[PDB]
Amino acid sequence: LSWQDYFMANAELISKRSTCNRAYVGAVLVKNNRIIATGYNGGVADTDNCDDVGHEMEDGHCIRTVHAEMNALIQCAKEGISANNTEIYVTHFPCINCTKALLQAGVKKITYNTAYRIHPFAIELMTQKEVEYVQHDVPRVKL
Amino acid sequence: LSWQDYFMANAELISKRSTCNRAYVGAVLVKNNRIIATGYNGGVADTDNCDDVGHEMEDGHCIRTVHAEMNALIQCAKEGISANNTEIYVTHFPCINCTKALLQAGVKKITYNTAYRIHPFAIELMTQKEVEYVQHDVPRVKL
Amino acid sequence: LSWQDYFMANAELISKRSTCNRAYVGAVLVKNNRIIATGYNGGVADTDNCDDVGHEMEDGHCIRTVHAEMNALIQCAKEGISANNTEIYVTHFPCINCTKALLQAGVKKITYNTAYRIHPFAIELMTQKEVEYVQHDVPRVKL
Amino acid sequence: LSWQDYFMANAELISKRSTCNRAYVGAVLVKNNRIIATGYNGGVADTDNCDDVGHEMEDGHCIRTVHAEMNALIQCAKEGISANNTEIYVTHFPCINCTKALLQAGVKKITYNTAYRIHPFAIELMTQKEVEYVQHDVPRVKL
Amino acid sequence: LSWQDYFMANAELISKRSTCNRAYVGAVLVKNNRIIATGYNGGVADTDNCDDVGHEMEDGHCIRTVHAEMNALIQCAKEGISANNTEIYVTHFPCINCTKALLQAGVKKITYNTAYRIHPFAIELMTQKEVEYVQHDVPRVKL
Amino acid sequence: LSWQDYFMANAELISKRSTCNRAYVGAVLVKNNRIIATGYNGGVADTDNCDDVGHEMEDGHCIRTVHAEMNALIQCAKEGISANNTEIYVTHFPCINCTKALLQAGVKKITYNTAYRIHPFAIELMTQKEVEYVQHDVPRVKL
Ligand SMILES: [Zn+2]
Ligand SMILES: [Zn+2]
Ligand SMILES: [Zn+2]
Ligand SMILES: [Zn+2]
Ligand SMILES: [Zn+2]
Ligand SMILES: [Zn+2]
Ligand SMILES: [Zn+2]
Ligand SMILES: [Zn+2]
Ligand SMILES: [Zn+2]
Ligand SMILES: [Zn+2]
Ligand SMILES: [Zn+2]
Ligand SMILES: [Zn+2]
């Protein structure tokens, strides 16, 4: 059982905690192969959730949640734990907004399981910032 | 100057470093009267800026920059410096996503200078999450 | 999955990285619902492992590895990450020394999956040191 | 008065705090010639001690205590202070178990005052891990 | 608006908080262009001040205050935030005492706005310690 | 030895590393019974010392060294290690500036061995700032 799997497996698990059916996504922040922070698709803590009270639409989607990736980053900021020089495992490739946050934060590698459309600017930023992104299936597992 | 005047002064001050024609924003994160992190309208560090190579519009908005509020938080993350129970001073009241991010980060007060129409969800959130928001102008300052 | 199910899941998960034929153990140190450190049946990092060069028996026990519980704590030490008032999830209940180490480290709960005969001194200790110990199975998990 | 002495002297002092006559041993963890953690031969804190209630035998010795070396390491884990890249001063060379812990922790040098039998595996591990161990008498001192 | 200005401007602002008219001086400790600590001319916190109760003379001056520079350093020590490898912006060049403290602390650059007489020993120490000091006017600013 | 005896012992111990003929001082900063930082009569690290090149008198006092009390605090600053709510053990009671620095740093007790005439302002301060000061001799110690 490799770290990539151990990590990519944790993402899929955490993504199940998404508090808004519109999207199940999980993210894990690793440093020295050590999980430091995690996140899934959910809104502010101690706040209603698209699950209990239904979505919070605004011409389109339940804007109620904070993206998993972002949530992971916020966990570092709230818990005061450095994210610079880390890598990340995400169920889906980050949207353009998160991609900028992750990079700004100092994340040096994006490991996704799947991805609809990777924003071209994402790719540009990643290139300029010299950050690699790699697909990596979710390992099938035991009891 | 008062503490508020000193902080809001910095908000207005740091916003001047913005690298995007379209907006000059500045955020100051404070904990126990100490500026711990800041932010302004800027893109990912070490990447082109709407300033040097021009904007990256897409739908009518140079999507290059990262909101000051966020950058201030990202800075916290990136440096392991905690933003739990902090207070923010911003030139303009946060958009709905920054609001979420900020509350999720653990900030308990948002002291703004300018403000359009605070999003309804913003208040629903600040209300539930018991965060207070106050207006305060930029003290006129000497040298 | 429940929080317990997510943690005990990782315990069982990380134990798979063990490098010693004779035992597959996995420890997950948790603080405020965040996995902060982990461990599995492994020897010193960057040294031969019962896996590659075979066991180092002496009296009938490959003494190469370090107990998962410990490695999880050592990881805490090595990274300056605190283990005070944390909670541990382990595949098998701690031997008497790990029990001591864990309590001395400041963990207040030991959630195990499997358990032989908890040492009497173990209970004397957990009792005095007011640490609680709970059993919980590994949730059956998908992909 | 050299640091080696200042440190080796502190070990002998702390070793006097051993809470079990069966063995008086002290240990000091240094980083940048700065004491970061210490330990002596004693059991879990806020627990009985071979001193007050007599030993806790198990076909041999009072298993009641945690080895000084280990205790020092635990202090880092409990207090959340990094031990990686540190050196150590111990009244006696570590047993094979502690030797593995210290190495795992990232201790880069063992300074002992005395030593019965250094486990061969200890020497092997230390070699593989490129860690030096040196004997160093205890300086005689003043008032 | 350059960082030198942003920083030198903050010093002049903080210097206005001096709680003893005999001297208005402010200091800012920067690391990675990030303010980490600050200080002005004032006495121990939660103590009287040459402002409210008049000076505390001793054949010369109100010894009641702690120099701004020193206060900044103390803020790091009290708040537990590393000052090694930082630079500093001060309204006035440090006296010989502070100069030694700053250097000991690990401050690698002194940026002053003005300076009466720079103690020769200061210059010597700075040279031996390879630390540069630079004058830098205070930028004139807005509302 | 008692805890006090162990700490005051170190104070007297570390003062022996002083590099200035004229005074041998030693400060031990303690938090929850752990020596966290120390100091002795020494100049800036990596600079000539009254010991090697002779004193730097000016008005009759080798102004080279930095007071032990301070160096202990500077060490705290330089290493990000907090000195809030700590306790200090010193060979000689602090001069008025160190007293200020120490209180401002957040230490709540000053356990000295020797003491000339405590400055009046020192008491005014320790009184207001509710810091207690105690005398205690250096325990006679063996090897
Ligand atoms: Zn939803
Ligand atoms: Zn996103
Ligand atoms: Zn633009
Ligand atoms: Zn925004
Ligand atoms: Zn084996
Ligand atoms: Zn064990
Ligand atoms: Zn015993
Ligand atoms: Zn041992
Ligand atoms: Zn005054
Ligand atoms: Zn000064
Ligand atoms: Zn001298
Ligand atoms: Zn002094």
Side-chain angles (χ1 to χ4, degrees), chain B residues 53-134:
Chain B
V53 312
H55 316 330
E56 193 73 51
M57 295 310 276
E58 195 214 76
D59 268 66
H61 310 71
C62 132
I63 62 172
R64 170 123 49 215
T65 27
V66 167
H67 297 195
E69 305 92 296
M70 279 307 279
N71 280 151
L73 283 176
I74 311 302
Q75 193 189 202
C76 270
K78 184 179 185 191
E79 308 291 350
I81 155 62
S82 163
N84 218 324
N85 298 84
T86 56
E87 166 185 57
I88 199 165
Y89 286 81
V90 302
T91 55
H92 312 172
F93 186 106
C95 80
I96 193 182
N97 299 284
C98 279
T99 302
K100 296 204 290 306
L102 289 180
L103 307 184
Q104 183 85 107
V107 322
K108 304 303 175 186
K109 190 168 176 182
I110 301 178
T111 318
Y112 56 107
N113 179 62
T114 305
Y116 34 67
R117 189 69 175 64
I118 290 74
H119 190 118
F121 192 32
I123 308 189
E124 189 184 327
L125 291 177
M126 302 195 280
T127 284
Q128 286 194 297
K129 197 69 185 178
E130 297 184 16
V131 166
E132 74 179 68
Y133 47 123
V134 181

Side-chain angles (χ1 to χ4, degrees), chain D residues 1-3 6 9-10 12-14 16-17 32 34-35 38 40 75 79 138-143, chain F residues 1-3 6 9-10 12-14 16-17 34-36 38 40 75 79 138-143:
Chain D
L1 182 57
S2 80
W3 290 116
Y6 175 62
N10 266 91
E12 175 73 8
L13 274 188
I14 290 293
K16 300 197 309 177
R17 308 230 89 222
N32 313 318
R34 182 184 69 266
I35 285 177
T38 56
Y40 53 78
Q75 187 171 74
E79 308 307 349
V138 173
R140 303 176 180 177
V141 290
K142 58 54 200 177
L143 229 195
Chain F
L1 281 173
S2 338
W3 265 147
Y6 170 64
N10 271 73
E12 166 80 1
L13 240 158
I14 200 57
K16 299 192 174 304
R17 293 188 56 64
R34 303 192 317 284
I35 286 176
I36 68 180
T38 70
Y40 54 79
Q75 193 189 202
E79 308 291 350
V138 178
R140 56 289 189 64
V141 288
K142 300 65 62 185
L143 228 309

Side-chain angles (χ1 to χ4, degrees), chain B residues 9-17, chain E residues 1 6 9 13 141-142:
Chain B
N10 271 73
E12 166 80 1
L13 240 158
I14 200 57
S15 70
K16 299 192 174 304
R17 293 188 56 64
Chain E
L1 182 57
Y6 175 62
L13 274 188
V141 290
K142 58 54 200 177

Side-chain angles (χ1 to χ4, degrees), chain C residues 2-140:
Chain C
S2 338
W3 265 147
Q4 296 200 305
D5 292 343
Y6 170 64
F7 294 150
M8 269 292 334
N10 271 73
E12 166 80 1
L13 240 158
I14 200 57
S15 70
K16 299 192 174 304
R17 293 188 56 64
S18 289
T19 64
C20 180
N21 263 176
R22 309 166 75 70
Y24 294 80
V25 198
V28 182
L29 216 51
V30 186
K31 187 181 187 187
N32 301 311
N33 266 316
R34 303 192 317 284
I35 286 176
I36 68 180
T38 70
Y40 54 79
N41 200 200
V44 182
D46 305 313
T47 58
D48 297 347
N49 53 328
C50 290
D51 250 354
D52 289 317
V53 312
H55 316 330
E56 193 73 51
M57 295 310 276
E58 195 214 76
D59 268 66
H61 310 71
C62 132
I63 62 172
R64 170 123 49 215
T65 27
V66 167
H67 297 195
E69 305 92 296
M70 279 307 279
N71 280 151
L73 283 176
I74 311 302
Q75 193 189 202
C76 270
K78 184 179 185 191
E79 308 291 350
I81 155 62
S82 163
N84 218 324
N85 298 84
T86 56
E87 166 185 57
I88 199 165
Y89 286 81
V90 302
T91 55
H92 312 172
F93 186 106
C95 80
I96 193 182
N97 299 284
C98 279
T99 302
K100 296 204 290 306
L102 289 180
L103 307 184
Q104 183 85 107
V107 322
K108 304 303 175 186
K109 190 168 176 182
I110 301 178
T111 318
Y112 56 107
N113 179 62
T114 305
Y116 34 67
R117 189 69 175 64
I118 290 74
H119 190 118
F121 192 32
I123 308 189
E124 189 184 327
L125 291 177
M126 302 195 280
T127 284
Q128 286 194 297
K129 197 69 185 178
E130 297 184 16
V131 166
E132 74 179 68
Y133 47 123
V134 181
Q135 189 298 309
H136 189 78
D137 301 321
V138 178
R140 56 289 189 64

Side-chain angles (χ1 to χ4, degrees), chain F residues 67 69 95 98:
Chain F
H67 297 195
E69 305 92 296
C95 80
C98 279

Side-chain angles (χ1 to χ4, degrees), chain D residues 19-23 41 49-51 54-57 61-65:
Chain D
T19 191
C20 147
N21 56 53
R22 282 284 246 71
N41 194 201
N49 51 206
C50 289
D51 254 17
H55 309 323
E56 178 73 18
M57 264 64 214
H61 338 60
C62 138
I63 63 176
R64 151 161 296 149
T65 56

